[PDB]
């Protein structure tokens, strides 16, 4: 699978979401260059206004584009599962608010890497930081801690995203993740390590639809 990532790969993302009965869709397009752990993406809310803050959807909206150092290449589950792909599931617990549960399939469709996602949010406060749109549109930088899951022939991960609220405080989003291969071939089950991830959020000045531009870097480390 690693052979598939040696140059620049086109990405497509498609998300259907329902948070407290507020239904929405997001489409994304861009490119990934795993050699440099580099992702360039643009996401569009295709149903009108996004009912949650864009920063809360970043993590859900392709860790196969991580740069694994040469000395850690035997720990890259994500690429090993390609082209058949993997299922990525999360529960994201927003402290003192609701939770997202997400299920995604990440696979190649020809030469394009596709991430198709369903997201379901419940228990949110209607005037809280998520449904009330109180989060800053900020750089996001944290480590994704990975461990092997031998029973599912895959991995688990956990991490905390600290979203700045507009009043200077923090909205914690505790992430629990599991990935399992779609195909039955061998996959690389890693030793414990992390992905150092940085996502820079911006706007396209010519774009009038509700949208998010991202420049993201993802680098494996810890060994």
From Swiss-Prot:
Changing residue 43 to L: In mut3.3; shifts fluorescence lifetime from 3.03 to 1.88 ns. In R10-3; matures to the red-emitting state with excitation and emission maxima at 555 and 585 nm, respectively. Changing residue 142 to D: In Cerulean; leads to improved quantum yield, a higher extinction coefficient and is 2.5-fold brighter than ECFP. Keywords: Chromophore, Luminescence, Photoprotein. Photocytes. Changing residue 74 to R: In Azurite; shifts the excitation and emission spectra to shorter wavelengths and increases quantum yields compared to BFP. Changing residue 139 to A: In Cerulean; leads to improved quantum yield, a higher extinction coefficient and is 2.5-fold brighter than ECFP. Changing residue 196 to F: In H9; increases fluorescence at 395 nm excitation. Pfam families: GFP. Gene3D superfamilies: Green fluorescent protein (2.40.155.10). Changing residue 218 to R: In Azurite; shifts the excitation and emission spectra to shorter wavelengths and increases quantum yields compared to BFP. Changing residue 139 to C: In mut1.9; shifts fluorescence lifetime from 3.03 to 2.74 ns. InterPro entries: GFP, GFP-related, Green_fluorescent_prot. It comes from the Eukaryota. Contains a chromophore consisting of modified amino acid residues. Maturation of the chromophore requires nothing other than molecular oxygen. Monomer. This is Green fluorescent protein.
